Design a protein around this ligand. Structure first.
Ligand SMILES: CCCCCC
Length: 198
């Protein structure tokens, strides 16, 4: 349910924030929240970007606008500032979700534990977040990934058949993956990416 990538790949800020604000609730689909540190990270960053955007939606109409306006505003401090920094981290939590969901949809699993999703959560964490966490934070995120629900309970919860659920996730993944990949491409192109750990 994300907007299709526009012809020119300039992602509009407001509709983006609106769409991705629907993602933290899925971490609540089993009742007690799952992967809470990932949820909290995404949520907190969305809030920070929306706060900058809301001050001047026309100035911050696109995500590229955020980066270029804040670069001008903040000089040498940029990109470790403002909505740019928040989106730098948001894209990592969003990529976590992308890789996790794609891995599940592709039937990736531990053949000895086919109803767990630990292999899929570990893979997603490795590709999206792990490089950017210190040892304390790694232990936090690690505990959450380990306490993942059963695969069957996860799929049930999103469907509140299993194959039909997976088809819907695959559909979602098309514009979702493209959008995230465009954000990553922009960060690299603008030299807005930082590698510091938390
Ligand atoms: C945890 C995010 C799930 C999103 C499914 C559409």
């Amino acid at each position: 349910l994300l907007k299709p990538l526009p012809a020119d790949k300039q992602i509009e800020t407001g509709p983006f924030l609106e769409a991705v604000s629907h993602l933290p609730p899925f971490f609540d689909c089993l009742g007690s929240p799952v992967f809470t540190p990932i949820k909290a990270d995404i949520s907190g960053n969305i809030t920070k970007i929306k706060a900058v955007y809301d001050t001047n939606p026309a100035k911050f109409r696109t995500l590229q606008n955020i980066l270029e306006v804040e670069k001008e505003m903040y000089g040498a401090e940029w990109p470790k500032v403002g909505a740019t920094l928040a989106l730098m981290w948001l894209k990592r939590g969003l990529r976590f979700i992308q890789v996790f969901l794609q891995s599940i949809c592709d039937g990736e699993r531990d053949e000895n534990h086919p109803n767990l999703i630990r292999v899929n959560a570990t893979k997603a964490y490795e590709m999206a977040l792990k490089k950017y966490h210190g040892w304390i934070v790694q232990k936090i995120f690690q505990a959450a990934l380990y306490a993942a629900p059963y695969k069957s309970d996860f799929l049930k919860a999103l469907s509140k058949t299993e194959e039909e659920c997976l088809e819907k996730i695959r559909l979602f993944l098309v514009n979702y993956t493209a959008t995230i990949d465009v954000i990553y491409e922009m960060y690299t192109q603008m030299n807005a990416e930082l590698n510091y750990k938390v």
